[PDB]
Design a protein around this ligand. Structure first.
Ligand SMILES: Cc1cc2c(cc1C)N(C[C@H](O)[C@H](O)[C@H](O)COP(=O)(O)OP(=O)(O)OC[C@H]1O[C@@H](n3cnc4c(N)ncnc43)[C@H](O)[C@@H]1O)c1[nH]c(=O)[nH]c(=O)c1N2
Ligand SMILES: Cc1cc2c(cc1C)N(C[C@H](O)[C@H](O)[C@H](O)COP(=O)(O)OP(=O)(O)OC[C@H]1O[C@@H](n3cnc4c(N)ncnc43)[C@H](O)[C@@H]1O)c1[nH]c(=O)[nH]c(=O)c1N2
Lengths: 520, 522
């Protein structure tokens, strides 16, 4: 008896939809019919985008697509961290860092460099102990990651022989990634591409979807439906009546204004990182690419009108407020009660979302798809398959939401009503527990070298954001008081970070030069 | 004012005690005074203990003690698995397997070999699909591990050149491991050994221990106390008054009768595995070493009297009850509500315990030790360090309690009250959750190759036990129906098991011959 899913209908032709078609195309080995229904009429988000390092391994590698192939197609650039600018100090927006009391610029990094360990203790803890004992004033990113010296010099993460120097994620234009995966899906995975608008969702009496009707009159039948229709959530929210859980009491930002600023790569090179530039009522991203950089001011629409934000955004880069090609989007912050209901699976903005502070959005998509491939059902829609998928989404999303909440709740700024309101907010119990662990000087979420998605943000990453913002431990890791040999060892690791950080800038090619050989 | 712990007092000098002293002696880098108070007691028959593969990485390697060096000191032998004999068929115990309704012997293995994967799916899942679809008649352990063929031939997990062939753990007389560690702490880390009986625990107004009185009139001052006093929990249960949570409503067995049996190694060879031989009111371990095997009937004393168990144990091996030297113990099952209270940390039998069906005892020691070192305090005894250590202990203990529940609740024997009463136990929520996941065809706790202690028992292990006992998923993993190529890729994996089983059975030395060379007996 064949009780398999025979047809999969994906509603949506943005990044979520085509990622889904590309990945299920590879995963279901031409046993299922895959249809993408997408309205050219209804724009897709596409704003210039950044990612995290597992993208290549957990997605493109699955598709059999080498990095340098996809990268060359979407004008892709290298990302080694998020660099935070003017998060600690008061004032209006500026690209340039204000000065701290110690005379350092108000900047701190969030690299993806893995912290070295000595005696089963990561370097961060050795660094925190010397700090709290008055034996060093040096900053955490400068002391613990060579990457920092590479980024400040704007050098690349690869040599010209393409030998890897450091860990890195990607910047790219979303549209181009969408377009690349659309061609891939259609011409290599044989996905049917339907260009039209859905007008009606047909369900049966048990509340399962049977087809989507299009304005042209075609009826697209299917056994499984994936909702990549964006924030409107036309299947999961509208048709299935799954409620969205609003979480504007955990993160306040709900709006953005973006554009693509052109840029002189011969003069200033290219920064190999995403900058996140604090503002009075939020922050602004900057995503360097060959010839241009994407940017956008994320803000709360309770603390600023579309005007003020557009104006502050425009001031930042010296843009004309009245004749610029702006991109205004209001966004959901939260997750659906249940991500997958009956025979509808939400993926993308139809599912969960947080502001783009740590580049969560594309990660969420390929993690949800992977979760769906693993729990892929037949027509009986086993309750346990659906519920384990849903528990996995739930955990992945709360992990990230708390890590983001950590960026705002510990910030010292109190100059504007936005920043003050970010301290009135209640922290989820799980983040408070981790803060407690941290304050006791213990590690939070030690790395383990699938289940990455459950605990994606490691000790290294909590230290960048806590110690960067100035949240320190109450005291040093107590065990270190008994470990004079391990402390000496860690002095060698600290030297090793400086000697490597010195050696690589002298030998490494600039980011621009590396993007020259890669691209046109 | 220096806030560090200057003196650590360990009560007890069995395995828990001397592992604690040696590990702390390395971890605290001679900045702390370590004192072991323990009573001489007496010397007893070594009924043998079995272990799991991390013992060397997580403990002996930390101390810089090479495998061969410590094995040579405790007549150790190799363990590639636990082998379950007659857990599916009724009747009195026999070392020899009974024959199942389908013609197979009633034996199944729990190896330590990690499973291979095709398309991010464990080979177990390919086996279960074929099995539920009628495409293989083969057992899980035969299908998915070459260790099964190596064990059936009694071949060693290493070659004579000492090159590794399989994953394994150890068999040994733990009294000797304790004596070897005692020597190492005393000669190489200047531990203070006080051979005396503790008679009083002194405490201050806030409930903290300040010193231990001995019979001879010592008052041993300390800042941190480790309770390694055994089941008595003299510090954590008596002095600190921390309740033990009895958990005999999750696992029934609470007793053991054990002896060491001389063995003809030139005749029978040496099994590289621990055997679990099902009995009417329990089960009996067989833990081979060179020259003898340790053995012991674990039982519930609600369902059997000591004399009954002891007689059934003897009959199993053809022993003369009156001419055999037995050790007899009644053990508690559970954990202390908090393993660490104030300045008293409990380790070993003083802390938590479960029957030794899957070799949890020494594991619980070095795991808790490791957790103590990670959360090692000063004299402020920050309540977050104490609470996180306790969190880890109970998560470690529940993982293992869950795993052991799976062994009994899914046994299809109904022939005696003991076996029936196993099926009227309440499963914990988390083991029930795993069963559901398994029953839906999904993986259970997928492997990821520190934090191993959270999630130690992985998908392979849950399949060895579930499938061994007869609990199958209700239907294959559904994704597999859509993956004709992955299925074919797993067929090659199945073939690599068979071939590697053929080669290693031909090329490996007998476990006997390897032991002879390692212990220098030939
Ligand atoms: C301001 C901002 C900034 C970022 C991000 C979001 C936001 C709001 N993200 C998230 C990321 O952009 C997002 O995950 C995808 O790129 C686009 O999401 P979707 O495909 O789900 O919806 P999207 O809205 O993009 O597409 C919806 C699709 O559904 C179709 N549709 C809707 N209604 C229809 C109907 N009735 N009939 C037919 N079709 C219909 C649309 O036409 C379209 O094809 C992100 N992530 C990241 O990793 N790093 C980053 O830097 C950012 N940056
Ligand atoms: C039946 C059975 C079978 C097994 C196991 C246990 C049991 C009960 N174990 C567990 C393992 O054998 C055990 O945990 C350790 O070997 C010994 O643990 P302790 O040191 O905590 O107790 P243990 O009882 O050995 O030591 C207590 C110490 O405290 C001392 N003491 C008590 N009161 C005192 C006082 N007032 N003053 C001074 N000193 C005092 C004692 O004298 C002794 O030195 C096991 N594990 C495993 O990993 N695999 C296996 O196969 C088995 N098998």
């Amino acid at each position: 008896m064949d009780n398999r899913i025979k047809t999969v209908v994906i509603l949506g032709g943005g990044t979520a939809g085509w990622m889904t078609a590309a990945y299920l195309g590879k995963a279901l080995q031409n046993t299922v019919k895959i249809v993408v229904l997408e309205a050219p009429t209804i724009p897709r988000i596409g704003v210039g985008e950044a990612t995290v390092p597992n993208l290549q391994r957990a997605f493109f590698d699955y598709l059999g697509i080498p990095e340098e192939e996809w990268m060359r197609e979407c004008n892709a650039s290298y990302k080694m961290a998020v660099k935070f600018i003017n998060w600690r100090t008061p004032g209006e927006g500026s690209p340039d860092p204000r000065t701290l009391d110690d005379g350092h610029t108000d900047t701190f990094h969030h690299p993806f460099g893995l912290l070295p360990s000595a005696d089963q203790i990561p370097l961060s803890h050795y660094w925190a102990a010397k700090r709290l004992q008055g034996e060093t004033d040096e900053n955490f990113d400068e002391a613990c990651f060579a990457d920092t010296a590479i980024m400040n010099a704007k050098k690349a993460p690869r040599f010209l022989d393409m030998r890897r120097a450091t860990n890195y994620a990607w910047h790219f234009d979303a549209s181009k990634v969408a377009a690349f995966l659309r061609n891939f899906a259609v011409t290599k995975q044989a996905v049917e591409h339907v260009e039209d608008e859905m007008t009606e969702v047909l369900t049966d009496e048990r509340g399962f979807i049977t087809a989507l009707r299009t304005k042209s009159g075609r009826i697209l039948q299917g056994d499984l439906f994936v909702d990549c229709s964006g924030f409107r959530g036309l299947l999961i929210n509208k048709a299935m009546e799954e409620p969205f859980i609003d979480m504007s009491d955990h993160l306040l930002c709900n709006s953005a204004v973006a554009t693509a600023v052109p840029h002189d790569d011969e003069k200033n090179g290219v920064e190999p990182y995403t900058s996140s530039i604090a503002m009075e009522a939020g922050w602004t991203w900057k995503i360097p690419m060959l010839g241009r950089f994407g940017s956008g001011h994320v803000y709360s629409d309770h603390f600023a009108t579309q005007d003020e934000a557009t104006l502050a955004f425009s001031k930042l880069w010296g843009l004309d407020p009245d004749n610029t090609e702006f991109n205004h989007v209001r966004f959901r912050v939260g997750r659906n009660r249940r991500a997958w209901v009956r025979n509808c699976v939400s993926v993308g903005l139809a599912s969960c979302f947080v502001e783009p502070l740590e580049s969560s959005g594309i990660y969420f998509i390929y993690a949800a798809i992977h979760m769906l491939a693993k729990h892929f059902p037949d027509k009986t829609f086993d309750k346990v398959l659906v519920d384990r998928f849903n528990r996995e989404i739930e955990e992945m999303f709360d992990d990230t939401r708390d890590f983001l909440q950590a960026h705002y709740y510990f910030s010292p700024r109190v100059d504007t009503p936005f920043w003050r309101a970010n301290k009135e907010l209640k922290l989820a119990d799980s983040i408070k527990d981790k803060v407690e662990t941290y304050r006791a000087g213990l590690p939070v979420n030690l790395p383990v070298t699938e289940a990455e998605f459950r605990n994606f943000w490691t000790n290294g990453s909590y230290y960048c954001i806590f110690a960067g913002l100035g949240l320190m431990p109450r005291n040093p890791l107590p065990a270190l008081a008994y470990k004079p040999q391990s402390i000496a060892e860690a002095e060698l690791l600290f030297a090793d970070v400086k000697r490597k950080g010195d050696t690589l800038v002298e030998s490494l090619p600039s980011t621009y030069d590396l993007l020259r050989q890669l691209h046109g």
